[PDB]
Design a protein around this ligand. Structure first.
Ligand SMILES: C=C1[C@H](CCOP(=O)(O)OP(=O)(O)O)SCN1Cc1cnc(C)nc1N
Ligand SMILES: C=C1[C@H](CCOP(=O)(O)OP(=O)(O)O)SCN1Cc1cnc(C)nc1N
Ligand SMILES: O=C(CO)[C@@H](O)[C@H](O)[C@H](O)COP(=O)(O)O
Ligand SMILES: O=C(CO)[C@@H](O)[C@H](O)[C@H](O)COP(=O)(O)O
Ligand SMILES: [Ca+2]
Ligand SMILES: [Ca+2]
Lengths: 675, 675
């Protein structure tokens, strides 16, 4: 049949791509081609409009199998060709060794790090449910799309997928349909050596529906029926067990050797001949297959055409909601939304930046409907919920509704991070956030790094940023954490010092379209600073206290800016004149003009950094660095600061030593470099 | 009864400790005091010998409940007193806000970061099984101890515990007995808002045995019976469901408010009066309770006394094994074990450091029985198994035996990290390791940081360290990873350049007693260097190529040392004389004398660093830094190096620019500082 020919075409494109590269993973593509064929036939998508908001989404969580995904996208006429497949895994190609949403048309997310994709799918489905609950009306199914995920044994072993699957079951996400490639093979061999759990029983314990397909090597009728069955179960996510043979058809099928290395040339020849292809030909695309696939594309395009008319009719009947939806699909925030940001003066009371964050969220959530977010079981400590909002829950629970805006993630930081990526990936201008303690953002590093690589505007509300948290002690107090994330490309790491800086941090986080944000916020109260503003803090770094005859400039962040200002007063008594720079985001600062940056960190004056955590990175901005490069302590926070000499007198002492160290030396800005 | 009085004493000590600090967590201690009393009565331990190798181990995975643990340790006469309890959460005390093994006598591991402790318990149990299989003989039960773990809903939500529980079930670890505090309350309120899974059904799916105690607020008889039942099930770990009331007895019992803040003074008064205590008294210790507990200590000490005689008799009957066991319990490696380390010359072939690592392990595993380790489903890529060894598996599977030395962790990096901490915590000189790709060590950051804080000599075999891995691309290629771990206190991060350096890295990792190691290893082949040796590389940094008239020194690590040597030749043609420093471990280097370090990084010469990842940290050792501060690419590795100008000519160009930048400037060593 043409279906059989399509499946063979997919299999052989994937194997030929791997062969051309002499690198990559043929096994799972061979095993999953029947399922991929069946799922893509059920999916609604437009290869010529990858951003249609009511498309079904597909996620390849087992991202190493990407030769499969690329083959589907090529066959369906996405902006990806056979010539791109011939450049699989080659420098600069549109067919990288794992899929990247920034590079591959039709890749919704970036996968390859196991476990992430299924969690991203949970997020896409969460967003779809929230979006549909917000906009759909009688006779106006604006959003009714599904989220299809392929995953393997590796994803099922990674703890992040357990977190997300538990939560997805709790959230009754009926439009999520995941497919487990049950092939009993991972890199170390049989799953019998390390993975003997009853996966199906575990998924039932989370509240998922199960469908089993015992011969997924051939039975596309049963795979299609499993999708139909899943669609009838509207209050549970579904796991479809696909029992497959890894490398199906290969001489080496059912072995770990077929997982991750090119097939032998003679193996590829026998594959081709057994399936009716020419063993002398590579990258064959039978025109029957193209035609069949084009039929499905044409049908899908007519569905999108009708959706566009539905949307026009919706704007007529529901003018307010229609305009809001249009704005969001155009990628634009509400006009002058930022007028809602709180502004402070130096006469206002001291406030912890976690509390300032709560206040910002309380003002901006009502103004910007595309903001949703949650906390990983730290809502009353992170202060991440705006009073009066309702939680995102299935209405059946009585605990919230899908139109809700606040997500109870539970103690699941890693899944929260990957779910945030999925919510961003959904689109419709979602600006989504997740709260935990800064030290436990580290639990989610796998996902955070992908936020940066994927260019997703997600936001971590990362409270309890330092030894300032006090008694919980060194297991809770960040040391390395800011250095880690600042060293990752494309992460804005805001550490606001006061009310105005906190508003600037949120302005940046919400306006972001391509850069994830981490907001490092305090437990302890900080004063409102003389000289701060949203405008100045929006530059990432700025001169807080200008001293035209400075003997030294002190550059600081967050809680240490007030400390630097107090140190300036101590220094004045010692006959030393200091300026103060506040550097609430190093990335934003780095992006300013060379002239702007030199106005903040000039030549001809020693510069001392002060921040109560690692000194790594700080030499970009300073000549000497006062930081904390050891673990913290359990005690009252002011006593910990005193112990480590983060006091006005301790900073002044180090400032004075810095001035003395550079006496009779020529000093140039830390911004200067040889190349 | 005296049991009832003991339980009340425990509860009130915990509440009084929290009250004195005006900080901490009274709820879980109140709820778990009956279970703690029952478990400690079943446990064998010596408060006067915390290192007795056949003790039962206890782990508080819900570490915030540590006022409970501290109360038990005080009551049993560990080196922790009521005066220490009065200093709960105070700077410098032996009663920190979360338990720390370095500070608290009787704390086996450091908990507080949720999910870790249960995984550490899996590791303690894994080690006990391996140890018993290695040493026990007929009539000589050298090791027969149990591992008892308390955990709460938070630990059960964290994905790391799912990973470890799946693996523990697979491994049939019958001496692991975990207790779930089923109190239906977390920080965000009822578990109904985020955690509605059937926990018991999930644990059955992993192959655990279950015992349910429906009234764990009072029924210590049933808790004791549950332990007895668990001990009869020798081929499954057991989860005991303890249905408790959080804050049992408090006016605020069964609420989230009792989780994490001090009780009201009037609440504490009514607690005391309802249980027969004086509401005017704090830190009461009824002498009946002390006496009862001392009886159990005396019995346990007699058990240890008999164990010591068993051990003496074992040494008589099994002289070889007895001497080996004695050596290990004394914390000493085999005499001259390091003579097994491979040594190379510059005439030897180029080899990838992953392969050099395999060769080291192949030579040292037969020489050092206390080495065990594994990989997170990357055995044939990390090259972490010595040929001829058998896997750690229950013999019932036919796949290995408990005497085995190689662990199939599956795709479970985070649990692998926390399990490694447990294996180290067991003691008996275990030197244990875990393989994955360097980029995915980041999945385990929660555990890695605890290795450092806990001072455990664990080792990550972290291959595929850079863009040198090639085609798998940017989702697999580290950028930030070394900076992250180098910025964490107390992590040795070795990045060996060649055969001799790889042997030095292992010498350090195996000899370690207080410092975790990460070995960053290559996929790609590297040449044997002229000038390398185990002796020189053991200093962490050393002069590879000495140039007495150097215009510049190039400091590099790993794969970039050979690059620097090739750049030196290019520079010679441009009339520039370079020296080369190899810096295989920055921590080890930092610990050398000031004079040694200055001999490597002298005054009066510009120093350029070269390493194909983040430049963070490098200003400690260099004036200018050539690194990679953007994500990588999918392509053939040499082409990626060329793209980013990590070539002999690209390094030479930057070296020449560095020399020019410092012309007519006075240059001092980067080792100098103002304070
Ligand atoms: C261990 C592996 C994988 C084997 C996974 O096996 P399945 O997932 O069972 O694949 P199949 O054999 O059916 O093709 S592929 C690469 N990976 C290394 C790796 C490790 N850790 C993380 C987080 N991300 C990774 N990609
Ligand atoms: C969210 C919480 C915990 C609530 C946990 O609830 P159970 O664990 O149910 O406690 P119980 O209410 O029964 O006393 S305590 C602190 N913690 C923050 C926290 C977050 N992430 C990580 C990794 N480590 C942490 N400690
Ligand atoms: O992490 C934990 C304990 O392991 C939480 O229980 C925190 O102790 C608490 O959330 C801090 O509370 P505040 O800092 O908001 O007072
Ligand atoms: O991480 C993955 C894919 O997501 C593995 O399949 C690696 O691709 C493989 O282990 C690398 O193999 P070698 O680098 O040892 O050739
Ligand atoms: Ca598999
Ligand atoms: Ca609980």
């Amino acid at each position: 049949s043409v279906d059989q020919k399509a499946i063979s075409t997919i299999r052989l494109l994937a194997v030929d791509a791997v062969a051309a590269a002499n690198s990559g993973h043929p096994g799972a593509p061979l095993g999953l081609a029947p399922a991929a064929h069946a799922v893509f036939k059920k999916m609604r998508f437009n290869p010529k409009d990858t951003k249609w908001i009511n498309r079904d989404r597909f996620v390849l969580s087992n991202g190493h199998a990407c030769a499969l995904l690329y083959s589907m996208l090529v066959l369906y006429g996405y902006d990806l060709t056979v010539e791109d497949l011939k450049k699989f895994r080659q420098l600069g190609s549109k067919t990288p060794g794992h899929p990247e949403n920034t590079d591959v048309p039709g890749a919704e997310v970036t996968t390859g790090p196991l476990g992430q994709g299924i969690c991203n799918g949970v997020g896409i489905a969460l967003a779809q449910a929230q979006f549909a609950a917000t906009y759909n009306k009688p006779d106006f199914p604006i959003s009714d799309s599904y989220t299809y995920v392929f995953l393997g044994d590796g994803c099922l072993m990674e703890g992040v997928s357990s977190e997300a699957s538990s939560l997805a079951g709790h959230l009754q996400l009926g439009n999520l349909i995941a497919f487990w490639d049950d092939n009993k093979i991972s890199i170390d061999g049989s799953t019998e050596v390390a993975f003997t759990e009853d996966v199906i029983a575990r998924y039932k314990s989370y509240g998922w529906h199960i469908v089993e397909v015992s011969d997924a090597d051939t039975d596309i009728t049963a795979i299609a029926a499993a999708i139909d069955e899943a669609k009838k179960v509207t209050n549970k996510p579904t796991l479809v067990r696909l029992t497959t043979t890894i490398g199906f058809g290969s001489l080496a099928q059912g072995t770990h050797g077929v997982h991750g290395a090119p097939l032998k040339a003679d193996d590829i020849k026998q594959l081709k001949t057994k399936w009716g292809f020419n063993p002398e030909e590579s990258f064959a695309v039978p025109a029957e297959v193209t035609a069949s696939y084009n039929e499905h594309v044409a049908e899908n395009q007519k569905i999108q055409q009708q959706w566009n008319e539905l949307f026009a009719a919706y704007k007529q009947k529901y003018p307010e909601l229609g305009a809001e939806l249009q704005r969001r699909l155009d990628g634009k925030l509400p006009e002058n939304w930022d007028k809602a940001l709180p502004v402070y003066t130096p006469a206002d009371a001291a406030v912890a930046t976690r509390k300032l964050s709560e206040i910002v969220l309380s003002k901006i959530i009502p103004e910007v409907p595309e903001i949703i977010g949650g906390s990983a079981d730290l809502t009353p400590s992170n202060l991440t919920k705006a009073k009066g909002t309702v939680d995102f829950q299935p209405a059946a629970t009585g605990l919230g509704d899908y139109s809700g805006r606040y997500i109870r993630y539970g103690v699941r930081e890693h899944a929260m991070g990957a779910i945030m990526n999925g919510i961003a990936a959904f689109g419709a201008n979602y600006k989504n956030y997740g709260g935990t303690f800064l030290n436990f953002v580290s639990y989610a590093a796998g996902a955070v790094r992908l936020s940066a690589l994927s260019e997703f505007p997600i936001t971590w509300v990362a409270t309890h940023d330092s030894i300032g948290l006090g008694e919980d002690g060194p297991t809770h107090q960040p040391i390395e954490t800011l250095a880690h994330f600042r060293a990752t490309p494309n992460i804005s790491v805001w550490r606001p010092a006061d009310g105005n800086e906190t508003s600037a941090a949120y302005k940046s986080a919400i306006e972001s379209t391509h850069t994830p944000h981490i907001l490092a916020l305090t437990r302890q109260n900080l004063p409102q600073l003389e000289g701060s503003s949203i405008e100045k803090a929006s530059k990432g770094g700025y001169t807080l206290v200008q001293q035209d005859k400075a003997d030294i400039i002190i550059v600081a962040t967050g809680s240490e800016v007030s400390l630097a200002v107090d140190a300036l007063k101590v220094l004045e008594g010692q006959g030393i004149k200091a300026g103060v720079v506040s550097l609430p985001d190093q990335l934003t600062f780095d992006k300013q003009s060379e002239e702007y940056k030199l106005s903040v960190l000039p030549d001809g004056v020693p510069i001392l950094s002060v921040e109560v955590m690692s000194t790594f990175g700080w030499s970009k901005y300073s000549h000497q660095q006062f930081g904390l490069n050891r673990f913290g302590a359990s005690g009252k926070a002011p006593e910990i600061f005193k112990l480590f000499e983060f006091t006005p007198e301790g900073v002044a002492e180090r400032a004075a030593k810095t001035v003395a160290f550079y006496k009779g030396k020529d000093v140039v800005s830390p911004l200067r470099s040889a190349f």
